[PDB]
Structures are given as structure tokens and as C-alpha cells.
Amino acid sequence: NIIRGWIFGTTLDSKTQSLLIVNNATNVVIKVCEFQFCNDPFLGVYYHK
Amino acid sequence: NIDGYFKIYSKHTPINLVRDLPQGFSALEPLVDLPIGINITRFQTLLAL
Amino acid sequence: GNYNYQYRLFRKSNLKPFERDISTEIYQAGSTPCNGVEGFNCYSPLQS
Numbered sequence A: 001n002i003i004r005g006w007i008f009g010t011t012l013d014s015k016t017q018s019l020l021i022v023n024n025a026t027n028v029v030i031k032v033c034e035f036q037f038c039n040d041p042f043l044g045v046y047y048h049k
Numbered sequence B: 001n002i003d004g005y006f007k008i009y010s011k012h013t014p015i016n017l018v019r020d021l022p023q024g025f026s027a028l029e030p031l032v033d034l035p036i037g038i039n040i041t042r043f044q045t046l047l048a049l
Numbered sequence C: 001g002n003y004n005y006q007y008r009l010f011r012k013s014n015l016k017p018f019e020r021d022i023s024t025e026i027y028q029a030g031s032t033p034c035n036g037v038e039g040f041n042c043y044s045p046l047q048s
């Protein structure tokens, strides 16, 4: 489960409506909201023995 | 994405051969329909690390 | 005085069927550059 989700928009920074899939191990959630994003954002996971 | 609707078709298949693009035939079932409505021009993906 | 109802006055291009827009940037009605908030040929995107 390396890949998690997707984003959709026209400019993707705090000024246009944007769509977001994130698929966690639990129930997936879809949102359509305004958003601001980081330069290289992701959901870095950590191994737990 | 057509006239205020976002349609996603999905399929999960098992493969046990080379990483290259497989041959053979398989169809995609309709997964979900989203009634949102938005201009879309770009997209990007997210992965866990 | 009911002044809470607004709509759009100039737009770059026509919308699509069932498409929503909440833009608030000032429209450059003229070809001159428009910065900040207020100026000539660029005053306001919406009207009440």
C-alpha cells in the first residue's frame, strides 16, 4: 500500500475548489473543498515491528 | 468528468507474470459516481513512503 | 435593505452545465495590468 490517493484541480492552491481522494486502511473518504498544499506532500509511513 | 459528474471505473486483478503490460482481455466495472461540479485541468497522485 | 444577495458582473468565459464558481479576484476589464485590489478598469468581480 504505497500509493494512497489523488488530488484534482486547476491550480491547486487555496483559491480554487479542489478534489481529494485519500484511501486509508479504514473506510476511504472523498472531499471536495478548497485546499493549500506543500511543495512535496505525501503520507510517509513508518515501519512498526 | 462530464457535466457536473465524476465517474470512476475500477478493477482489481491478480497477475503472476512479468511486470510488463499484460496481454489478454478484461473489462472495468463501474465503481462510483460523484455529483460535484468543478472545472478540472490538472491532477496529481500521492504515495506513502 | 437586503444587501446579502449577489451575483457576477464580468467573467472571463461562460460556465459549463452544472458548474460552480466562488472566485473573488478582480477582473481586468481592460488590458492594463491590475495588481493589489483596486484600480481603474478593474474594480470588483461581484455585485450585490
Ligand SMILES: *[C@@H]1O[C@H](CO)[C@@H](O[C@@H]2O[C@H](CO)[C@@H](O[C@@H]3O[C@H](CO)[C@@H](O)[C@H](O)[C@@H]3O)[C@H](O)[C@H]2NC(C)=O)[C@H](O)[C@H]1NC(C)=O
Pocket (backbone or CB within 6 Å): A010, B039, B040, B041, C012, C013, C014, C015, C016
Ligand atoms: C477551466 O480552467 C482552465 C485553466 O485556467 C481555463 O483555461 C483558461 O482559459 C482562459 C480564457 O481564455 C485563458 O486565458 C488566456 O490567457 C492567454 C495568456 O496565456 C491570453 O492571451 C488570452 O487572451 C486569455 O486571457 C487561460 O490561459 C486558460 N488556461 C490554461 C490554458 O491553462 C478554462 O477556461 C476554464 N473553464 C471554464 C469553463 O472556466
